[PDB]
Enzyme design. Sequence first.
Site, PDB file in Angstrom:
ATOM      1  N   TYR A  72       0.855  -1.205   0.000  1.00 34.98           N
ATOM      2  CA  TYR A  72       0.000   0.000   0.000  1.00 34.98           C
ATOM      3  C   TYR A  72       0.891   1.256   0.000  1.00 34.98           C
ATOM      4  O   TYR A  72       0.667   2.204  -0.759  1.00 34.98           O
ATOM      5  CB  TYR A  72      -0.898  -0.031   1.247  1.00 34.98           C
ATOM      6  CG  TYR A  72      -2.006   0.974   1.272  1.00 34.98           C
ATOM      7  CD1 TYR A  72      -3.298   0.601   0.919  1.00 34.98           C
ATOM      8  CD2 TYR A  72      -1.783   2.281   1.722  1.00 34.98           C
ATOM      9  CE1 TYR A  72      -4.373   1.491   1.025  1.00 34.98           C
ATOM     10  CE2 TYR A  72      -2.872   3.206   1.813  1.00 34.98           C
ATOM     11  CZ  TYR A  72      -4.147   2.780   1.468  1.00 34.98           C
ATOM     12  OH  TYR A  72      -5.243   3.598   1.542  1.00 34.98           O
ATOM     13  N   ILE A  98      -9.343   2.152  16.668  1.00 37.76           N
ATOM     14  CA  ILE A  98     -10.414   2.542  17.578  1.00 37.76           C
ATOM     15  C   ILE A  98     -11.681   1.742  17.257  1.00 37.76           C
ATOM     16  O   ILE A  98     -12.337   1.197  18.153  1.00 37.76           O
ATOM     17  CB  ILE A  98     -10.707   4.068  17.483  1.00 37.76           C
ATOM     18  CG1 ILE A  98      -9.410   4.835  17.775  1.00 37.76           C
ATOM     19  CG2 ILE A  98     -11.847   4.447  18.442  1.00 37.76           C
ATOM     20  CD1 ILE A  98      -9.527   6.370  17.612  1.00 37.76           C
TER      21      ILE A  98
HETATM   22  N1  LIG Z   1      -7.852   7.578   7.620  1.00 37.32           N
HETATM   23  C1  LIG Z   1      -6.582   7.662   7.802  1.00 37.32           C
HETATM   24  O1  LIG Z   1      -6.067   7.672   8.883  1.00 37.32           O
HETATM   25  C2  LIG Z   1      -5.712   7.776   6.543  1.00 37.32           C
HETATM   26  C3  LIG Z   1      -4.352   7.720   6.687  1.00 37.32           C
HETATM   27  C4  LIG Z   1      -3.531   7.831   5.602  1.00 37.32           C
HETATM   28  C5  LIG Z   1      -4.061   8.014   4.352  1.00 37.32           C
HETATM   29  N2  LIG Z   1      -5.401   8.082   4.198  1.00 37.32           N
HETATM   30  C6  LIG Z   1      -5.969   8.264   2.882  1.00 37.32           C
HETATM   31  O2  LIG Z   1      -7.081   9.014   2.869  1.00 37.32           O
HETATM   32  C7  LIG Z   1      -7.963   8.588   1.895  1.00 37.32           C
HETATM   33  C8  LIG Z   1      -9.340   8.189   2.508  1.00 37.32           C
HETATM   34  O3  LIG Z   1      -9.251   7.242   3.512  1.00 37.32           O
HETATM   35  P1  LIG Z   1     -10.333   6.876   4.427  1.00 37.32           P
HETATM   36  O4  LIG Z   1      -9.707   6.586   5.564  1.00 37.32           O
HETATM   37  O5  LIG Z   1     -11.304   7.818   4.394  1.00 37.32           O
HETATM   38  O6  LIG Z   1     -10.884   5.514   3.835  1.00 37.32           O
HETATM   39  P2  LIG Z   1     -12.320   5.167   3.354  1.00 37.32           P
HETATM   40  O7  LIG Z   1     -12.324   3.849   2.957  1.00 37.32           O
HETATM   41  O8  LIG Z   1     -13.271   5.491   4.297  1.00 37.32           O
HETATM   42  O9  LIG Z   1     -12.520   5.999   2.194  1.00 37.32           O
HETATM   43  C9  LIG Z   1     -12.164   5.635   0.880  1.00 37.32           C
HETATM   44  C10 LIG Z   1     -13.256   5.838  -0.226  1.00 37.32           C
HETATM   45  O10 LIG Z   1     -12.886   5.568  -1.523  1.00 37.32           O
HETATM   46  C11 LIG Z   1     -13.805   4.807  -2.131  1.00 37.32           C
HETATM   47  N3  LIG Z   1     -13.218   3.992  -3.184  1.00 37.32           N
HETATM   48  C12 LIG Z   1     -12.331   3.035  -3.007  1.00 37.32           C
HETATM   49  N4  LIG Z   1     -11.963   2.490  -4.132  1.00 37.32           N
HETATM   50  C13 LIG Z   1     -12.633   3.091  -5.074  1.00 37.32           C
HETATM   51  C14 LIG Z   1     -12.693   2.943  -6.458  1.00 37.32           C
HETATM   52  N5  LIG Z   1     -11.990   2.052  -7.091  1.00 37.32           N
HETATM   53  N6  LIG Z   1     -13.479   3.751  -7.129  1.00 37.32           N
HETATM   54  C15 LIG Z   1     -14.199   4.645  -6.497  1.00 37.32           C
HETATM   55  N7  LIG Z   1     -14.179   4.802  -5.214  1.00 37.32           N
HETATM   56  C16 LIG Z   1     -13.419   4.060  -4.459  1.00 37.32           C
HETATM   57  C17 LIG Z   1     -14.371   3.941  -1.002  1.00 37.32           C
HETATM   58  O11 LIG Z   1     -15.619   3.416  -1.267  1.00 37.32           O
HETATM   59  C18 LIG Z   1     -14.410   4.927   0.131  1.00 37.32           C
HETATM   60  O12 LIG Z   1     -15.604   5.636   0.185  1.00 37.32           O
HETATM   61  C19 LIG Z   1      -7.306   7.399   1.153  1.00 37.32           C
HETATM   62  O13 LIG Z   1      -6.748   7.771  -0.043  1.00 37.32           O
HETATM   63  C20 LIG Z   1      -6.320   6.949   2.208  1.00 37.32           C
HETATM   64  O14 LIG Z   1      -5.174   6.328   1.760  1.00 37.32           O
HETATM   65  C21 LIG Z   1      -6.222   7.958   5.280  1.00 37.32           C
END
Ligand SMILES: NC(=O)c1ccc[n+]([C@@H]2O[C@H](COP(=O)([O-])OP(=O)(O)OC[C@H]3O[C@@H](n4cnc5c(N)ncnc54)[C@H](O)[C@@H]3O)[C@@H](O)[C@H]2O)c1
Lengths: 297, 297
Positions: free
Chosen positions: B137, B177
Amino acid sequence: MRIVVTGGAGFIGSHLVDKLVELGYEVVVVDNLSSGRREFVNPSAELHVRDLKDYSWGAGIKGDVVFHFAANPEVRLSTTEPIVHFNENVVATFNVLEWARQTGVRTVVFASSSTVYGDADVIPTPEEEPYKPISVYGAAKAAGEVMCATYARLFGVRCLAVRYANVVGPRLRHGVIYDFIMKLRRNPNVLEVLQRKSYLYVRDAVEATLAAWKKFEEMDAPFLALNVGNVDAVRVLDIAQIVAEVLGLRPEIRLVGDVKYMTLAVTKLMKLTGWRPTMTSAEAVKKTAEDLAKELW
Amino acid sequence: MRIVVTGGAGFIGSHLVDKLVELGYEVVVVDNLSSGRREFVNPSAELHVRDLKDYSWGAGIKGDVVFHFAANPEVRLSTTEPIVHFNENVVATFNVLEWARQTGVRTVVFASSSTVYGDADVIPTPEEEPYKPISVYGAAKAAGEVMCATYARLFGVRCLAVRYANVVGPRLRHGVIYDFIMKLRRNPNVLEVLQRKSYLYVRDAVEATLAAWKKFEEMDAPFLALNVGNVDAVRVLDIAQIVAEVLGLRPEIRLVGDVKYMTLAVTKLMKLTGWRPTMTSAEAVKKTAEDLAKELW
Ligand SMILES: NC(=O)c1ccc[n+]([C@@H]2O[C@H](COP(=O)([O-])OP(=O)(O)OC[C@H]3O[C@@H](n4cnc5c(N)ncnc54)[C@H](O)[C@@H]3O)[C@@H](O)[C@H]2O)c1
Ligand SMILES: NC(=O)c1ccc[n+]([C@@H]2O[C@H](COP(=O)([O-])OP(=O)(O)OC[C@H]3O[C@@H](n4cnc5c(N)ncnc54)[C@H](O)[C@@H]3O)[C@@H](O)[C@H]2O)c1
């Protein structure tokens, strides 16, 4: 041991295969013959026509080490669609790494490129310089290196990434020398030139690659990126002049994401292996024009 | 202007969409609802259920800026197949960049991750530290950044890459969490813990992201990578304790490619925008447990 060479029917790959065969290895070539040719494949090597864009490209293929040299050729980058550069480099390389992981391959020698540096701030460019590619192809090779280094750290599939400057020699069917010969073949009286880069004769490039691989197998670092190229460079206009003389022609030169200046620092390679180029860039270009003249004129 | 938010039905994306809507932007959400939920989508936003793995995912969709937040969630990385990480991150991101280039999008705000640093040599980690990902990833996010930076340099599609530390808040359905709450829901008397990381409440993360975007639109650098996270960190065992108290439970703790230690240096973000976190990591974790308790208990 069994060595798999993807892109082994291509320019650098076919010469690499010849040397591995000469050294005694059992060589397996995997190539989709998109830019390579069956005529370039060593009779002693085992050819499998597969497409690395297919995740299952390596079904039934086993090797202890893979020289991943398959890719579309690094030429006329701006005229090929980005998705082609992406699929032939990034997707193909990922598929090679998954096959390597799943079949227990110990080493990946990845053919990388000076293009990962883009228009480098420092020239000759040391390996420490950052990825600043300006072509989709360059970005694809850099992404390939990042994935290779990660598979080395996470899955133990060690990787030696060889960043090549320009490599030239027999069997070449792309690049500036080939282009000039084909242009003069079309009209020997005029030569249209649309840059200063380092050129290494293919014999030298293959020797350096194999010497580096030998040393890498004696090291324990999971990943190593090493520049492979000549110590000097030549300008496009000099290439044009050399090619003409080889052909015995006296053409009228006419000036009409591509990195403009490139020369890689090869101090690490020389220090690690004792390797030294046997021909200058100008000499590598002349020999290649003579080689190609017999194949194309 | 029209803002496209991929992954806008997910955790960070839905909160980002809420703020953009509150600020007055016309927001278009594109999400395949694989990990996101229609219930999280702001009524004022326009939802399009498309899959970014499809090159044609953006047919008919226009925007001036795209917040590319879609990806599989960063969790249980070692249990998902590498090809899934590759396709949902690298292929999807490339497809977003091609759509951006072909439709004339001016800015891509890419959701990157602290995982691009791997087990960083320097912690708190400054943006200058190299890509040394240890998860597929992480490699995929780094490759995505390399491609974004190249499209900025070559095609003028400017990119702000936000490297997030851990973000937490309402609507979260993955992560430590959430896992602890679901485990205690299964058995309130025992909590199995299988690390020290920085946690930022989602309100803070969205504010920082938008403030950075505003400043980035006032700059002329083609590409900028910026860390977004808290200044401190908490240990897994502290998270476990906080969650229990929020639930009014007194569980028996039982210890039974994942980066072990992470904290990003946020000096550049603070200097560029004046942003400051409003809650400590421990406070962000407690508020989130309280938020999730109402959604999940
Ligand atoms: N939450 C964290 O702590 C964290 C940390 C580092 C990076 N990120 C990044 O932030 C972003 C969002 O993360 P999140 O935590 O909200 O996760 P999340 O899963 O809640 O959100 C991701 C969204 O993308 C959508 N998605 C996934 N694949 C898809 C596709 N092929 N086509 C269309 N939609 C698609 C999913 O349905 C989801 O709604 C990501 O890019 C993730 O890497 C988050
Ligand atoms: N020649 C140079 O100066 C130079 C410079 C920098 C990097 N390189 C690298 O060296 C390697 C070889 O380059 P080359 O110059 O020999 O080019 P080449 O085209 O002659 O060789 C490439 C080979 O890979 C094969 N191939 C391509 N796509 C494939 C696929 N999907 N599946 C299977 N086989 C496929 C082609 O048919 C061809 O035989 C490449 O990885 C290239 O990026 C070469």
